[PDB]
Structures are given as C-alpha cells and as structure tokens.
Write a protein that binds this ligand. Structure first.
Ligand SMILES: *[C@@H](CC(=O)OCC)[C@H](C[C@@H]1CCNC1=O)NC(=O)[C@H](Cc1ccccc1)NC(=O)[C@H](CC(=O)OC(C)(C)C)NC(=O)OCc1ccccc1
Ligand SMILES: *[C@@H](CC(=O)OCC)[C@H](C[C@@H]1CCNC1=O)NC(=O)[C@H](Cc1ccccc1)NC(=O)[C@H](CC(=O)OC(C)(C)C)NC(=O)OCc1ccccc1
Lengths: 188, 188
C-alpha cells in the first residue's frame, strides 16, 4: 500500500504554508532553518510562513552543470523553530519509485494526501517555457494549488511538486547532496 | 493513526463520479445498484456516472419523522456493474468518532484523502437555509468540490460530506437501517 503514515509524519513535523508574490505553496522544511520551494514561486527577501512575514536570509535557485533550471530553491529563514532534520530520508541518487504519495499543506488544503502511483525519473521537461532537468513524472491530473507538495514513498522524501499538463504531474527531485554541510563560494 | 487503507479500499471499490445539473459529486455505492448523493445535488431522471449518462430508476430524498431534511438521497441506477455490498460497514446508531478520513473522487480530484480529526454527532444544522437533522461535524475547512465525499474510520462508513462554513465541515449520517431489504409503500 501507499505510505500514508510516513507522508503524514513528514507533513506534521516538516511543512509550513509559504506565500510569495506568486501565491501559496506547500513548503518542505529540511533541517535547521533551511527549507525548499519551487523556483517559480519567485522568493524575494521576505516571505510569509504560516501567515507570519519572515526574512529570507538566503535563497539558492538550483541549476545543474549545463546551466539549466532544476526548479528547486533552497531558502534559509529567520525564525525561531528549527525543523526536524529529515536529510536522512532524502535519496542519494536519481531513481524510479512505486506507489508514491503527494501531500499538500496550504490555507485551502491544510493536509491532503493523494496517491499518485508509480513515479518515473523523467529527465527533461519544458516547464511553462523553461527548460528544466531532473524531473519526476507521475500519471495523475495534478492541479494549481499543489505546487511545493511533498512526494514520498515510505522512508523517502523524493521531490516537491512543480508542474503538470492536465494528465501527468511533475516533481523536482530532492537529493541528499543538495543539503550536506560544506565550504566557501561567493554565490550571489 | 487515521484509517487510510480502509478509506482507500472504499474509494477504490465503491465510489464513482456523479454529475447532475448542480455539478460533480463524489458518489458512494452501497450495494447492488444503490448509491447515495447529497439531496442538494438535485438528481433528476438521468445522471452522469463516470461521464456515462445513466437512468435513475429511483431516487429517495430522506427525511426524518419531523419532516426535516436529512440531506441524503438514495438512488437506484440502471447500470451493469453491481457495487460491492458495504452495508456491514455502516453504523447501526448515531455516534461520535475519532480520527476520521474524508475521501473525495471527482474529475478534479480522482482520489484525495483528508484526515479531518474528531467527528461529533452535531444534530441540527441550517444548511444553506434548509433546516437539516442528524449532522456530523468535524473541525476542518472543507471546500466546494468535496460534497459527497466519504467519511470513514477504520471498519466504518459513517457519512457523506454535505456542507461547511469555512472552519467546520458537515456530513450527513449513514445508518445501517437506511438500506435494509424491506416491504411495500407508495413513495412518490
Ligand atoms: C503549481 C504552481 C501554481 O499553481 O502557479 C502559480 C504561479 C502549478 C501546478 C501545475 C499547474 C497545472 N497542474 C499542475 O500540476 N505549476 C505551474 O503552474 C507551473 C509553473 C510554476 C509556477 C509557480 C511555481 C512552480 C511552477 N507550470 C506548469 O505546470 C505548466 C502549466 C501548463 O502549461 O498547462 C497547460 C498545458 C496549459 C494545461 N505545465 C507544463 O508546462 O507542462 C509541460 C507541458 C507544457 C505544454 C504542453 C505539454 C506539456
Ligand atoms: C458541496 C456542494 C457544492 O460544492 O455546491 C454545488 C451546488 C458544498 C461543500 C461546502 C461549501 C463550503 N464548504 C463546504 O464544505 N456544500 C454546499 O455548498 C452546501 C449546499 C449544497 C449544495 C449542493 C449539494 C450539497 C450541499 N452549502 C453549504 O455548505 C453552506 C455554504 C455557506 O453558506 O458558506 C458561507 C457561510 C457563505 C461561507 N454552508 C452552511 O450553510 O453552513 C452553516 C452556516 C451557514 C451560515 C453561517 C454559519 C453556518
């Protein structure tokens, strides 16, 4: 069966509702005060988190070595609570998955769980006119309002929802190495 | 935890998308070719079931002995498939419940599961100007598009969703005796 309990434990401890100029997004918190949001949410220097205006201390829009959009933005937030560290639930590598759940946490839908079925490593996607890499595809008619939703199987947090064409949904991958403690680059 | 597996087994074998002049509703099939739908769906003599136009052979709008709306309409349908008989999962009596799931099956949401928490036997509700009895209440901001959605706990199918005020959701009760094989009244 689909891993509803796992999905629910992630939603309960590791999501917040985030709101930018582009609207509301489910927001997965990963560790400390670091979270993710689709790049097309256009995060600026402040964001609403559960309706509380919040400084965005850092925002990194991920791109691969071909200089292509990965559609993940990692944000660091000025808030008091630390997120439970869920980095050990992130996959090490690209992969296909079975029987995944897509979980949403917005004002309209404070917790909703959608079994999306099989998830395939899809690769290239033209996302609203933006070439994008490292996409996961599921055959489910996902909708507006579901962006940022968390895609899990039991024991793994695998992506966040970023797109769909009416029949399929698409998630940007999460990989363990996006979040490993590291060294010193000038990045802005 | 919430009974997601049970909810999913009911959705998979016993729901269809129903469409009337009022729009789409999740439709719970109970036994044979008998199903339910909120009364305010205004069922006529034909209905779409999974987009196939279908004769409604019978429609009974339930009312209690005070001649008050219960908001359940029982329909008998001209179709080939019989529903799995789920009458043994219907509660015998009015009751309060813990940790319920609300499940939806429409074109926009082909399967979505929402933990709504505690469900209380609420009684009287003024439903869009219509006095209504035998209502169940949960504290969840349910929305348009969720009418007809199935409210379960493990082992029990307890109601179908019919209303909400922005903060609470309301379901009409299902009771085992609504569907017991019976005798002879002229009812139209
Ligand atoms: C989530 C964000 C949102 O609601 O927009 C606020 C600005 C949303 C979710 C998908 C929309 C439809 N169903 C979904 O699952 N994502 C998008 O809208 C996304 C851009 C975006 C904006 C903000 C944050 C993240 C992402 N754009 C798309 O998904 C497009 C929509 C689209 O073009 O759909 C139609 C084809 C018009 C129906 N999807 C897309 O480009 O898919 C690839 C494609 C495009 C054209 C033909 C075939 C396939
Ligand atoms: C499902 C049906 C639908 O979408 O309408 C198609 C005609 C819908 C679900 C609720 C609407 C808002 N959230 C919900 O969970 N039910 C209704 O719209 C229902 C009438 C109906 C129509 C068709 C089939 C079944 C039922 N009406 C209500 O739920 C009303 C809506 C309402 O008045 O909401 C506001 C107060 C305007 C926000 N709800 C209601 O009457 O609640 C009691 C109440 C009323 C006024 C003040 C406080 C409490």
């Amino acid at each position: 069966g689909p891993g509803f309990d796992f999905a629910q434990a992630i939603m309960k401890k590791n999501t917040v509702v985030a709101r930018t100029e582009k609207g509301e997004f489910t927001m997965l918190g990963v560790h400390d005060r670091v979270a993710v949001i689709p790049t097309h949410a256009s995060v600026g220097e402040t964001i609403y988190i559960n309706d509380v205006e919040t400084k965005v201390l850092d925002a990194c829009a991920l791109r691969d070595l071909t200089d292509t959009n990965l559609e993940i933005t990692i944000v660091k937030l000025d808030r008091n609570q630390k997120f439970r560290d869920i980095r050990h639930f992130l996959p090490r590598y690209e992969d296909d998955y079975n029987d995944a759940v897509l979980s949403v946490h917005t004002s309209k839908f404070p917790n909703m769980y959608i079994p999306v079925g099989q998830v395939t490593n899809y690769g290239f996607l033209n996302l609203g006119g933006t070439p994008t890499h490292r996409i996961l595809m599921y055959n489910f008619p996902t909708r507006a309002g579901q962006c940022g939703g968390v895609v899990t199987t039991t024991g793994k947090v695998i992506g966040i929802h970023v797109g769909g064409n009416g029949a399929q949904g698409f998630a940007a991958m999460l990989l363990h190495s996006y979040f490993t403690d590291t060294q010193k680059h000038h990045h802005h």
